Amino acid sequence: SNTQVESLIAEILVVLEKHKAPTDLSLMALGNCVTHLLERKVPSESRQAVAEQFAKALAQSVKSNLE
Amino acid sequence: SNTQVESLIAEILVVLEKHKAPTDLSLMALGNCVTHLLERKVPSESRQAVAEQFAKALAQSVKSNLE
C-alpha cells in the first residue's frame, strides 16, 4: 500500500514539476484538489470535519518532519 | 492564471481518477504532496505557519462551498 501511496504522490509531484509551478501555485492547486474531492465524495455534513482532520494531519506531519 | 491553476488541478485530479483511488487515499497522497513541497521549498522556520495557512484556506474554502 505504501508503494501505492508513494506512486500516486510521485505522479502528482511530477505534474507540479512539469509545470515548474511555484510553491504558492502548487499549494493552491493541491488545496483545490482536496476541496474538489470533499465536495464530490464527502457528505456535506462531514465535509468541514474531514477538512479539519486533513488539516490536523498536515500540521502534525509538518511538525514531526521538523525532527 | 485561472486557466493555469485549473489546468494543474485537472491534471492532478485525472491522476487520482486514473487510479480510481479512494477518497482517503487521495487525501493522503494530496497531503503528502503538500508536506513534500513545504519540506523542500519552505524554510523550516515558516513551514508550520505555511501549513497552517494552507489549512485555514482549505477550511474556509470548504465552509464557503457550503453555501
CATH code where residue A48 lies: 1.10.3390.10
Please give the method by which this entry was determined: X-ray
Secondary structure percentages of chain B, helix, strand, coil, to 5:
90, 0, 10
Question: Is B47 in Cβ contact with A54 (below 8 Å)?
Answer: no
Resolution as reported, in Å? 2.3
Please give, one letter per residue, the 3-state secondary structure of B37-53: HHHHHCCHHHHHHHHHH
Containing structural domain, residue B20: 1-67
* Distance in Å, alpha carbon of B61 to nearest chain A alpha carbon: 7
Consecutive H or E run containing A65? helix A44-65
Decide if B35 contacts A32 (C-beta within 8 A).
Answer: no
Secondary structure percentages of chain A, helix, strand, coil, to 5:
90, 0, 10
- Take residue A5 and report the three cell numbers written for it: 501511496
Domain total for chain B?
Answer: 1
Residue in this structure with the C-alpha cell 512539469, named with its chain if needed: A18
Best mutation target, B1, B19, B24, B32, to test chain A (most A CBs within 10 A): B32
Helices and strands counted in chain B (H then E): 3, 0
